[PDB]
Design a protein around this ligand. Structure first.
Ligand code: FMN
Ligand code: 951
Ligand code: DET
Ligand code: DOR
Length: 366
């Protein structure tokens, strides 16, 4: 625990970042993870951390966010890392390369990253076969409280966005415990305007119809993942459509195209989505707002700048049933997962909660 926590944070990771640019480090990390070349994950999840939501049991509330394992190559290594659930993607229907390099940038002074990957993806067919090869193993993992999510994107040249997502539902829906309709990527022109009302209702109506057409045992929950950069009108509209159509949950939030005042990193003006610490409270506030607009009736996965138990608990109290992290992993390495879980459990006891479930939305009941 604390030993290689400090070793990874003070020595290992800083040395990795000195040797490798962000995208190279990302690639290597995916390789190592898929091979199980990880530190020992000694933290044992207590019953306090268990959550039941989205039609599943989650043995702990800390997931790996979409974008790390884009093509489904490292899923088992990620469970080994200690994540209570794993989300792969975004996956696009056809293979595509994404934007030209460089397309990932570190802001060390801000504990932040900026990326404009642009949905680089092996495509549905490759990922489908990848997941099929471990399908029964995943079934046991899920039954064991370790669910799998799949994040669906759309091709850059795609003429019909709803049809791209419908394809993803048909191909990967049968292999996922939940699907994410990602209408919040900063890095595909036009995508985020799928977040407007009548266009979103049409989009999500088609997604849900395709989902309902799958056989029962293979029918995933469907979640919508939104940006932190929405107007009050956007959020209000999304909340309304989500409740009207019976969307199963929200993921809040993606990266931000904003650049908060105070960023110090030399690369702060690179185009792309900003993640990590500068995003943290913007994300938490968006969770707070969406939870209230949905009357606490729509499950929320909270994401954005989580690197400690306090960060996680603040999102849970704000209305998140589950949280994810990504950027924190790039700075502190695999030990950050056990760290977050251990601190979350301590804070829960400290504040008088019997478990995570009791803390969900607790700020709204004060
Ligand atoms: C390098 C990188 C790539 C990402 N790729 C995706 C993606 O493909 N699909 C998606 O829905 N979110 C993607 N994200 C967003 C993350 O899932 C997450 O919402 C965001 O980074 C905020 O969490 P964080 O501060 O813990 O990193 C990406 C983020 C980063 C840093
Ligand atoms: O480095 C970036 O700026 C970066 C940018 C974008 C995405 C990921 C990024 N780095 N990720 C590093 C990482 C992940 C996992 C491990 C790791 C470390 C040590 C042992 C085992 C493992 Cl799996 O290192
Ligand atoms: C199959 C068409 C080409 C898709 C390549 C997508 C990237 C695969 C490797 C992921 C890690 N990365 C390249 C982002 O550093
Ligand atoms: O959803 C996404 C897509 C990703 C990319 O550019 O591939 N970049 C992000 O920050 N969020």
């Amino acid at each position: 625990a604390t030993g290689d926590e400090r070793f990874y944070a003070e020595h290992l990771m800083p040395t990795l970042q000195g040797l490798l640019d962000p995208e190279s480090a990302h690639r290597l990390a995916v390789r190592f993870t898929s091979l199980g070349l990880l530190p020992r994950a000694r933290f044992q999840d207590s019953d306090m951390l268990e959550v039941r939501v989205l039609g599943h049991k989650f043995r702990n509330p800390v997931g790996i966010a979409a974008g790390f394992d884009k093509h489904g190559e490292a899923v088992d290594g990620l469970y080994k890392m200690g994540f209570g659930f794993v989300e792969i993607g975004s996956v696009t229907p056809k293979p595509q390369e994404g934007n030209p390099r460089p397309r990932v940038f570190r802001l060390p002074e801000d504990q932040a990253v900026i990326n404009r990957y642009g949905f680089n993806s092996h495509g549905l067919s490759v990922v489908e076969h990848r997941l099929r090869a471990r399908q029964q193993k995943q079934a046991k993992l899920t039954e064991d409280g370790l669910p799998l999510g799949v994040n669906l994107g759309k091709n850059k040249t795609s003429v019909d966005a709803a049809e791209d997502y419908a394809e993803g539902v048909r191909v990967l829906g049968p292999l996922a415990d939940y699907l994410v309709v990602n209408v919040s990527s900063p890095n595909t022109a036009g995508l985020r305007s799928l977040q407007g009302k009548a266009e979103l209702r049409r989009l999500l109506t088609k997604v849900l119809q395709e989902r309902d057409g799958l056989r029962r045992v293979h029918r995933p929950a469907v979640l919508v993942k939104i940006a932190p950069d929405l107007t009050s009108q956007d959020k209000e509209d999304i909340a309304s459509v989500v409740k009207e159509l019976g969307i199963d949950g929200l993921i809040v939030t993606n990266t931000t195209v904003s650049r908060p005042a105070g960023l110090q990193g030399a690369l702060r003006s690179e185009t792309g989505g900003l993640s990590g610490k500068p995003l943290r409270d913007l994300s938490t506030q968006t969770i707070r707002e969406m939870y209230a607009l949905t009357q606490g009736r729509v499950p929320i996965i909270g994401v954005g700048g989580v690197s400690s138990g306090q960060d996680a608990l603040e999102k849970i109290r704000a209305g998140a049933s589950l949280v994810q992290l990504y950027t924190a992993l790039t700075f502190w390495g695999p030990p950050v997962v056990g760290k977050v879980k251990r601190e979350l459990e301590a804070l829960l006891k400290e504040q008088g909660f019997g478990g995570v479930t009791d803390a969900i939305g607790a700020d709204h009941r004060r």
